Amino acid sequence: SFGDGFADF
Amino acid sequence: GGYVAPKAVWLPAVKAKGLEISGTFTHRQGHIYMEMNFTNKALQHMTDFAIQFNKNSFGVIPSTPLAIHTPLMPNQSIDVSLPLNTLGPVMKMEPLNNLQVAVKNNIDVFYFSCLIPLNVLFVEDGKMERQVFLATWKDIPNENELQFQIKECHLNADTVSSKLQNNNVYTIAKRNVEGQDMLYQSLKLTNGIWILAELRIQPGNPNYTLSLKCRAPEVSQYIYQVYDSILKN
Amino acid sequence: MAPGGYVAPKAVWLPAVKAKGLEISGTFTHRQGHIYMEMNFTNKALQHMTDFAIQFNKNSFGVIPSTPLAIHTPLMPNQSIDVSLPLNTLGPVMKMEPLNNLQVAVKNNIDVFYFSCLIPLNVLFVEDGKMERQVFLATWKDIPNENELQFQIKECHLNADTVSSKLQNNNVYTIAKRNVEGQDMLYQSLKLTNGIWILAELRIQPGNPNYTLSLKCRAPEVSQYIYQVYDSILKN
């Protein structure tokens, strides 16, 4: 994802 | 029902002293919700939950306080459905559909951000008249036109239209040219922005070309992305 | 002028104010085949910073880091480090607006922060960009005149030899030159990392502090960005 905060990483 | 993204861990426990928040966004019968799962992975009971949104691109804001009355016990989880509206204060975010959030409990205040899939902001009243489509498509400068590929799509034109209609993306015209299907589509955002789309489906090409024209062309990539997700789900 | 070509000075991409003390400034380079995002990370907080990582959103030219960010020492308060991040163009592709926009996410131990910056297209000009003269003429003829876009490079006083040399240092090749009534015409080619060839004709007039750049490309949307690049190369 891109833009979903901690969930991007 | 429209596309709903799988929940994602917006706030991992190790970053919020045991508080874990999983979440997604839904649009049900004209209402927008932030759908969250709060899990207590700490040793202490959790109370006094509250939520706040920073200013954001589409004026998204909770319609009520979070209101969790019952205390949340260690290893216990609750599923919360937070109703949202788009009449809040506005600030352009980077990326555009990123939302900054703060959640409070009895232990501390924690900050995180999450992604708003733009389909939750597609309104029911998004079917454009064909006459206005054609004149608008022509008038909008081609520099505002941006093109994307929906790759290795295994759907026929009719399944494409139906899936997209379930997400408030309307096919107002379908034209066949030399074997190639062209689907002419419209949608409108909660903030009033209209997006015009042409989707080209060529038999023998599993890659469909989506062309988007908008007077705010910066929204286009985000529309493409959720468009892609809808047809892959 | 330097081997690798024109590098813009670092600009602040992420102000400490928007990132809880983390300040990032950057630029892009193209040196000996390789593309880099050259950054400076500065910690303006009172607590140290660790667990650094970077990701790019899908973008027009498929730009993506080739390696993880590897900062193996904590970034202390008021400390500043130079970071050279190698990039390649084999990553996922999504059309950006503007065309050269790059969206970046940077994580530390505190939070995930986002910013954007603009890739100067010269870093995406490949060494293999010298077109054959026979192919230039045919291609210029064939490409519909709807694709031709014209630009003015203003306040430039370099001669045709020096223009050619500076542009060649940035992988823009001058494959022919013609001199008609005081006016130099340079026929030029370049090629981007994604295979797109751009054909140029540059006209130089005396008493004229400005040159006419005419571009033909089967993807004409790139042309204006190529112009901005020429201007930067010849003004710097």
Author numbering:
A (entry chain P): 1 to 9
B (entry chain B): 705 to 937
C (entry chain A): 702 to 937
What does the paper say about this structure?
Adaptor protein complex 2 α and β-appendage domains act as hubs for the assembly of accessory protein networks involved in clathrin-coated vesicle formation. The C-terminal “appendage domains” of the large subunits recruit interaction partners from the cytosol facilitating their concentration at sites of coated pit formation. We identify a large repertoire of β-appendage interactors by mass spectrometry. These interact with two distinct ligand interaction sites on the β-appendage (the “top” and “side” sites) that bind motifs distinct from those previously identified on the α-appendage. We solved the structure of the β-appendage with a peptide from the accessory protein Eps15 bound to the side site and with a peptide from the accessory cargo adaptor β-arrestin bound to the top site.
We obtained co-crystals for Eps15 P-short peptide (SFGDGFADFSTL) with the β-appendage and see density for the complete peptide. The peptide forms a tight turn with the side-chains of F2 and F9 in a groove and that of F6 lying against a shallow pocket. The tight turn is formed by G5, and the psi and phi angles for this residue lie in a region of the Ramachandran plot permitted only for glycine residues. The turn is stabilised by the side chain of D8: it forms hydrogen bonds with the backbone nitrogen atoms of G3 and G5. The D8 side chain also forms a hydrogen-bond with Y815 of the appendage giving specificity to the peptide. F2 is surrounded by N758, Q804, V805, A806 and Y815 where A806 is found in the base of the groove. F9 projects into a shallow pocket lined by A754, Q756, K808, and V813. There were two β-appendage molecules in the asymmetric unit and consequently the peptide binding sites are in different crystallographic environments. The peptide we describe (that bound to molecule A) is sandwiched between the two molecules but is mostly bound to A. There are a few stabilising interactions with residues from B. We observe hydrogen bonds from the backbone nitrogen of chain B L819 and the ring nitrogen of chain B W714 to the side chain of D4 along with some other interactions via water molecules, as well as some interactions with the partially exposed F6. Mutagenesis of this site confirms that Y815 on the β-appendage is a critical residue presumably as it π stacks with F2 and H-bonds to D8.
